[PDB]
RNA sequence: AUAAACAUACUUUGAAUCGGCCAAGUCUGGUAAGCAGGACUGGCGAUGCGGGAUGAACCGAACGUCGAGAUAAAGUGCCAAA
RNA sequence: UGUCGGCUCUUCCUAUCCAUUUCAAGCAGAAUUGAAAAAAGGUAUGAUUGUUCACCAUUUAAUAGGGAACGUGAGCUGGGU
RNA sequence: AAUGGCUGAAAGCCUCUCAAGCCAGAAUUUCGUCUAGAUGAAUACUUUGUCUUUUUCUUGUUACUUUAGUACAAUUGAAAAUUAUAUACGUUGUAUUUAUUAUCUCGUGUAUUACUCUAUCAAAAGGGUAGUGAAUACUGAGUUAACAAAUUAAAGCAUAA
């Protein structure tokens, strides 16, 4: 028969299922639609929690009721260090999805990025890279490189920066860095690559990312909780207090 | 060398919706698409030439063959009836067999 | 002996449905299909006419678990193997065996844009249609569904078709000069002897 | 029943030349130029010389044929025709459509761009939203008299249908529109020439 | 406009039954899927008999003066008279016909001869061009 | 379909054995000709087999099958209302011809089968004469139409082949 | 007229059985029922085989173990032989 | 095969109560009435009764009708039977 | 979508179309966006460069070790579009498997190639240039043939990542 009344139902299908991510840091599902006729840009970055505070704001909105002393707001803070970006990568559309042809590097790469390649580094022999640094200025190597360059003005249609932090710059315990590949919107491929190449090797601060007053998307993991029962999972009503065998449960 | 034969397909046995004889197989020969063009190949003959992986220790040979007759046409579609001296396997099904050129009667 | 080549059908100006039927029915035979532009096959019916359809095929899916359910694939590609897949003998091996034996795509690939294409004539759409009946292309039935590398396709076979432009051009400059050669061959005095030959069984 | 034979023809005027490429009609007079696809796998469209008038001389005609086809095929013989007379007549003399503002208390402005590519009407029945309404490409707006306004174009198809987009933006919703006799209306269509 | 009309006088050639690849001369028109067809059975052989459209192929070729239910004596007459035998024989149909009947009585030893010697001609070509 | 020519007399004290009725009969073959004949007898006369003694049963060949004529049919049959008489007229060059068209064609637009059709008689009516919608274009002595969208046509089922190499192509034939 | 000699007429002793069900160019009560009850016949029960995708009863046809052929109901785009 | 109702929870039907888009009126406006597309989202709190049902007092944009072994007892309760 | 329209026949007029062709129109559908996600791709390092089976070491993997067997560079496979297809012709009438004149040697250079290889410029090319060889045509001459013959299996753990 049909329930006698009528309720939202508790839960969200749009989050099933419910499993636990894997890694710490969460990658953005999709990059802001690229423009052809503007300047070419990173368009992220990454920066670490670091707590949350309270500030009194002017109100700026007119045709409000809101006091004109101020507004008590939450604010979160984030310290973001300068990231180093130490390669690019392009894309190629497919019947398939994206592919990427080619990954261009530097020609130094700091310890922070090779021990993304490893599992145990105090037994590893840590020759990340090395072949890579040690031919990087040979004749051979040198055309190689050229190449890629000139495969992804040709053959690609998005270009990535793989930016990595500097975990030498915070107070967390990882050495370890962390690798973000950040898109370049912006002029055609040609000078999209041009951008790219100008920042091997060089550091990005957040201020050449983001603007003032900017609305900003954040992707990232929540705070763990374990195993939990229905009550705190979803939101179910509780039993009543005369209910045989528990009462925080599904009937 | 040269070739003196026709490919013709296993297709499968002489068969029903829910039964199958596996007495008389039936074919598909290469470039015969009709049942007046049958008449030719009716007694010829036809061999499941088949490949096995034999160990060194065995004198038993790697290639191997199984033989028959062409015997009747199926069908309007040049589809032919062949009985084998043993029962082609059915795992053979959709392989290539050999159509030669005798008996001859030219 | 052993099939090793593989058959090219070009998907284009044919039907889904009598495609698959003669495929079907080969692939059991033990012979190797590719069947590119698997997207510009041909479907009766209108778009609006194509859509009730589909809609009435997504509604098909397991209650209480919709990851078990029927899987709706949107790309014309798996819309072609599902068609083939439906005609072929199911759970056993001789059913895995020959649906093993197919491929579509959505254009022509690299390796299969070089190859002899064929044609399957009981499934034209020439011949099996009125002219006036409206039809629908896959390709932009898909669309229509959410199969989002449509435009993707378009462009590759662009380039594709320019590209065959002018080998095409240069072909036919040699041929032409070939065909000249051969000319003056048939009649040079000393080829006398064999020309007489061919000229006899009308080849010449 | 089916026809063994339907056939149709359009005389063609001096100043005006056609080229047939596989049911695509292209039409040049001396106002510009027209083309048009009819994608109609039955009809053959061919231009000849023919005696249409009773005792006249033979005249350069485009042919729109179509053999034998039941009556729903055979209807659209006359319709291509139609269109490829239309098309002859407005690279001759243009369509123009003249649409009149029926307002009852709250007078209505209409705004129109420089160039004529779009129009804005203002204050329609009161209504703080003005609509915008842009126009096709090939067709002109502009400001005949007093709450009058005049498209001019080539195409009748492209001048029609802008003359209805504009009426169909100015619709008095959830009122009696037997009382409420508000919008902008086709008075009349007439030719520039 | 079409060329080639299904009328009374145009020439066809039947494509299948036991006239194959014969001439034949339309006389009367029965309805849209049927013709009569009476390819002077004196001349070409074919009886006067009604076939389906879908047997015959049109030719470039139209018997002139022949009128409906033409009679055997006289359109015999005119089929001479517009020599259909020898303009048939000139066009790329014709040579067609001819050389399937070359090919048929053409044995083993012949295909020999034809295939080695078209395998050098054809080579000799493809070298002389530069 | 075939047409008979069928005599016969009655022997009995109702009627006098001097007076032989005939019919043409269009049939498969002479036993079903027969059988058509007896209910005619039986179900305007009150002749029964019994009683009666058959005479002839010789086909009727056309004479001259190679003549083109209009012929028209007289006929009733049974719908789910009642009993109509139709008149239809086809173009063929001989009689069993035509009653096959016939047949067919009141198989398909009345969705008839052939045990309820009675056909009163088929005669042979001018040029002029046909009223059929369609058949009306064909009488002319210009009659003219080019047959497009032809399907190449296949020499016998020996070059059936089930794949074909290349592109394909109708006609305009 | 047709058929009938492993035809015909039996005699004695005895087993199980008398819960039935279905079909229909049939009937009665009931608004009707895959309802209740009957006349005639054929079936299922006791019965597998080929076809109707599947089915106690429908259609063909009833069964020792096999080979080769012509078939029946019914089918011949692929699953599926044509 | 654990036999009513309620509590908890999910899903499904549309013969739709609200919200969205339209047509009609004996539609001037407001409030309404009849109908179409549409089932993605909502559809309540209490007094009395074991009650389903019902009847009152409110509130709401609306407080629509139904199925799932007359949903749901190794899910509860045991008011009724 | 329901609905309101544009052009417009059928049916000389009318008509939103139980005709062809379009426009506007929903808490609608699809992209875009969010979550889970299959076969995948790029890069870094370790290797290997004809190949596996069975044993065997390791927590496990790859490389690796031993005894044997097998192949040895060179003719494969592409017009597109339309089908009432500008004209003309209808080019008829067997898709893949399946199109090489047996073998080896001797002889002259030229010419050709979606042929192999090398070097270079390029390149997600049946690419360009130069050279080399192969096959073939000009186009040979000879020798020989008879009876026989013409898809990986078994064993290990020193070293390295």
Redesign the interface.
Known sequence: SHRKFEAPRHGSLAFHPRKRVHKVRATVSAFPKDNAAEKPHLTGFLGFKAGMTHVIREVKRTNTKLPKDGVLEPVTIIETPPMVVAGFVGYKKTTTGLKPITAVFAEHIADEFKRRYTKKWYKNTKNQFAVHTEKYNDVKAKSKRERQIRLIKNRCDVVRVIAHTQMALVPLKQKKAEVMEIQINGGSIAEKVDFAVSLLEKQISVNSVFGTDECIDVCSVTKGHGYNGVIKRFGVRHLPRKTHRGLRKVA | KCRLHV?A?F?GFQRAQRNQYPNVALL?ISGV??K??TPFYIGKRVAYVYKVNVKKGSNKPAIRAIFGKIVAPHG?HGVVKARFLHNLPPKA????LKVFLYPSNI | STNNKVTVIDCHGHVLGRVASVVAKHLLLGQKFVLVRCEDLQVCGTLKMRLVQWELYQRKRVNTNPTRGAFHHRSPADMVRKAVRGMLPKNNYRGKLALKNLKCFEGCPAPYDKMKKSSIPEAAAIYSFNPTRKRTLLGELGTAVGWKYADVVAKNEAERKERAAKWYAAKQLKQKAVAEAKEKILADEKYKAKVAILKKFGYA | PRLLKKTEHVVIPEGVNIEINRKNIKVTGPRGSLTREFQHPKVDIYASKLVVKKEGPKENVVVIDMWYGNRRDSAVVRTIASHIKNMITGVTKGYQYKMRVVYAHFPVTLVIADDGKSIQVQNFLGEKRTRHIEMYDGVVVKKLGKDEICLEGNDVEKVSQSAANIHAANLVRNKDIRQFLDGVYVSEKCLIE | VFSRFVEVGRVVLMKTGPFASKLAVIVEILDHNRVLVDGPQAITGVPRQVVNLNTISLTSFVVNKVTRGMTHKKLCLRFTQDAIIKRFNKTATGKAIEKRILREKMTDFDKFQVSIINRKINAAAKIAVS | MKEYYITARCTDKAHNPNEIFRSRVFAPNYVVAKSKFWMMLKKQHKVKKINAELLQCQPIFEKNPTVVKNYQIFLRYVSAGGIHNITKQYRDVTRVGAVRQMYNDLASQYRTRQDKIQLISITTVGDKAVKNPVLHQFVGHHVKFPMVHCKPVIASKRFNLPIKAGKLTTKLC
């Not at chain 2, 099904?93 to 290539?96: I, P």
């Open positions: 490919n397909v297709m598909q698409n009709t007046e063009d309007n099904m959709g392989q290539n």
